[PDB]
Design a protein around this ligand. Structure first.
Ligand code: ZN
Length: 143
């Protein structure tokens, strides 16, 4: 559909950037998250959400707020982290994508003079702290 908001353009740019992010061998990180189930059986009441579902919303300009877009993206990435071992490709790709998401989010918001968004309350430092805590929790279970 038709972009009527700066934030829709920003969200599209952010989504494409994150989905296209590649490792040093040109492997797309998002590829390993293609088969993540839409519903974690441990949390069966959360609405189905996948990158395919978020894409459809992004392309049809359905996100009019950064915080909702970030919430959905973080649901998927956090599910991939929860459901997989710290030594796995999926886990590590999910963390990398989440870190990259924050980096590009911040850059686009600076460029667009987006200051107020509640999405910006969750910083790179918060993500580092939260990932480090999860790694520590998970370690003994992976022995
Ligand atoms: Zn597009």
């Amino acid at each position: 559909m038709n972009v009527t908001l700066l934030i829709q353009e920003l969200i599209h740019n952010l989504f494409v950037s994150v989905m296209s992010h590649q490792d040093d061998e040109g492997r797309c990180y998002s590829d390993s998250l293609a088969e993540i189930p839409a519903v974690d059986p441990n949390f069966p009441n959360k609405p189905p959400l996948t990158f395919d579902i978020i894409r459809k919303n992004v392309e049809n300009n359905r996100y009019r707020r950064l915080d909702l877009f970030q919430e959905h993206m973080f649901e998927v990435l956090e599910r991939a982290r929860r459901m997989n071992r710290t030594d796995s490709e999926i886990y590590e790709d999910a963390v990398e994508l989440q870190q990259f998401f924050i980096k590009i989010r911040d850059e686009l918001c600076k460029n667009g003079e987006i200051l107020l968004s509640p999405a910006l309350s969750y910083t790179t430092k918060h993500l580092h702290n939260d990932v480090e805590k999860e790694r520590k929790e998970k370690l003994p279970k992976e022995i």
